[PDB]
Structure formats: structure tokens, C-alpha cells
């Protein structure tokens, strides 16, 4: 069971559920830390889509305003 | 709006987590690979205890400090996950 697996250290290297289709936000934030233009860039990619950065599967556009996109971009980039 | 809320209501949550993936396969993916295979528990219990590499990548799994009975219990649990 989960408790035994936690106890024995297994969860340091394993999760229960498969990786999600897109990149983890801590990885996105770390890639862009200290990079000029990152909030703009990500806002654009959240709004308009992205492929080829993290894998073969595209992110489709999301229907967000330049405000919702900026908000989310800032929050993503703060994940540490 | 709060970002943790937009994360939820625009569907971002469906595709992104905060934390990075761990190095080994997810237990639900193990369960899927080995489903219906007669000797899967015994195979996994040995791997769990002794470690090994090559099945999921080049990264070797280290041996673990489990009894053979605990290794079997963990095997059975992992296979259970759907
Ligand atoms: C705590 C006792 C556990 C348990 C229950 C499991 N592990 Fe690991 N694991 C790691 C890596 C890199 C792999 C891939 C190895 C390969 O490519 O062959 C695995 C694999 C597994 C499996 C699947 C084995 C298979 O042959 O299909 C299973 C069932 C599994 N593990 C269970 C990495 C690690 C660790 C990194 C330091 C640690 C700790 C553990 N695993 C611990 C456990
Ligand atoms: C709801 C509005 C969101 C927000 C805030 C983000 N996503 Fe996604 N996303 C997905 C996939 C597969 C990728 C990788 C694409 C590639 O490999 O190029 C991404 C990528 C991202 C990023 C990083 C972009 C960059 O240029 O590095 C960011 C910040 C991001 N997303 C945020 C997959 C999906 C989804 C699957 C259907 C959905 C829904 C979302 N993402 C939604 C959002």
C-alpha cells in the first residue's frame, strides 16, 4: 500500500498517476528564471499555443485575454 | 482572478502539474504494462527488491531494503492501480 511505499522511500522516485501531458510549472519557471521577456513570451504561448519545446504534443490555443494570460504567465514563472 | 483558480477553470489543471515527474515509471503505467500476465507479481517483486535497468529507460533502479514478502505486497498493490 501507499503507506508502505512512502515508508520504504519508493515515492522519492515514483508517483501513482502518469505524467500529465504538459510540462510541470516548476520546470517552466526554472527554464525561464532571470530571462528577459519571459512573462510576455509565455503569455503569448498560453494564448496562442506551443509545440516542440517540451515534447511532440502541441498545446492548443487557450481562450484567455492578454490580462488572464499575463496573470497565469506570472504565476507559472513564480513556481519554485 | 486568482491564478490557482484560472488554473482550474480554463482547463490548465487537466494538462499541467506543479511538480516535475519522478525518475521512475508511474505505478499506473506499470499496472498497464503488466496487466493479465500470470507471473507479473513474481517478476515485479524481484525487481522491486533487487533493482535493475533497461525496461523503462537507461536509468538503473537501485536495490531496496524490503523483505521478499513486502516486495510481493508492493507488487500486488502496484498492479492494482487503475
Ligand atoms: C520502493 C521499495 C520502490 C518500489 C515499490 C518500486 N521502486 Fe522503482 N524504479 C526506479 C527506476 C529508475 C525504474 C525503471 C527501471 C527500468 O528501466 O527497468 C524503476 C522501476 C520500478 C518498477 C517497474 C520495474 C519493471 O521492470 O517494470 C517498479 C514496480 C518499481 N520501480 C517499484 C527508480 C526508483 C528509485 C530511485 C532512487 C527508488 C527509490 C525506487 N525506484 C523505489 C521503488
Ligand atoms: C491554461 C490556460 C494553461 C496554461 C496557463 C498553460 N497551459 Fe499548457 N501545455 C501543454 C503541452 C503539451 C505543452 C508543451 C508544448 C510544447 O512542447 O511546446 C504546454 C506548454 C505550456 C507552457 C510552456 C510553453 C513554453 O513556451 O515553454 C505553459 C506556460 C503552459 N503550457 C501553460 C498542454 C496543455 C493542455 C492540454 C490539452 C492544456 C489545456 C493546457 N496546456 C493549458 C494551459
Curated annotation (Swiss-Prot), chain A:
GO MF term list: electron transfer activity; heme binding; iron ion binding
Location in or out of the cell: Periplasm
Keyword Flavoprotein attached: no
Alphabetical UniProt keywords: Electron transport, Heme, Iron, Metal-binding, Periplasm, Signal, Transport
UniProt PTM: Binds 1 heme c group covalently per subunit.
Protein origin, superkingdom: Bacteria
Binding site for heme c: 59
Name of the protein in question: Cytochrome c-551
Organism, as annotated: Pseudomonas aeruginosa (strain ATCC 15692 / DSM 22644 / CIP 104116 / JCM 14847 / LMG 12228 / 1C / PRS 101 / PAO1)
Gene name for this UniProt entry: nirM
Residues of the whole record sequence present: 43 to 104 of 104
UniProtKB/Swiss-Prot annotation, chain B:
PTM summary: Binds 1 heme c group covalently per subunit.
Residues of the full protein shown: 37 to 98 of 98
Keywords associated with the record: Electron transport, Heme, Iron, Metal-binding, Signal, Transport
Function (record text): Reacts with hydrogenase.
UniProt family annotation: Belongs to the cytochrome c family.
Sites where the protein binds heme c: 61
Keyword ATP-binding: no
One MF annotation (Gene Ontology) recorded for this entry: iron ion binding
Protein name as it appears in the record: Cytochrome c-552
Amino acid at each position: 500500500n501507499e503507506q508502505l511505499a512512502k515508508q520504504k522511500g519508493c515515492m522519492a522516485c515514483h508517483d501513482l498517476k502518469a505524467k500529465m501531458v504538459g510540462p510541470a510549472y516548476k520546470d517552466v519557471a526554472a527554464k525561464f528564471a532571470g530571462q528577459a521577456g519571459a512573462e510576455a513570451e509565455l503569455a503569448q504561448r498560453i494564448k496562442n499555443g506551443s509545440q516542440g519545446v517540451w515534447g511532440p504534443i502541441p498545446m492548443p490555443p487557450n481562450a484567455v485575454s492578454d490580462d488572464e494570460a499575463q496573470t497565469l504567465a506570472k504565476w507559472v514563472l513564480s513556481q519554485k | 482572478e486568482d491564478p490557482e483558480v484560472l488554473f482550474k477553470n480554463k482547463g490548465c489543471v487537466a494538462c499541467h502539474a506543479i511538480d516535475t515527474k519522478k525518475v521512475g515509471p508511474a505505478y499506473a503505467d506499470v499496472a498497464k504494462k503488466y496487466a493479465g500476465r500470470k507471473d507479473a507479481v513474481d517478476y515485479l517483486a524481484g525487481k522491486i527488491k533487487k533493482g535493475g535497468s533497461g525496461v523503462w529507460g537507461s536509468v538503473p533502479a537501485p536495490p531496496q531494503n524490503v523483505t521478499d514478502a513486502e516486495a510481493k505486497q508492493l507488487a500486488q498493490w502496484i498492479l492494482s492501480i487503475k
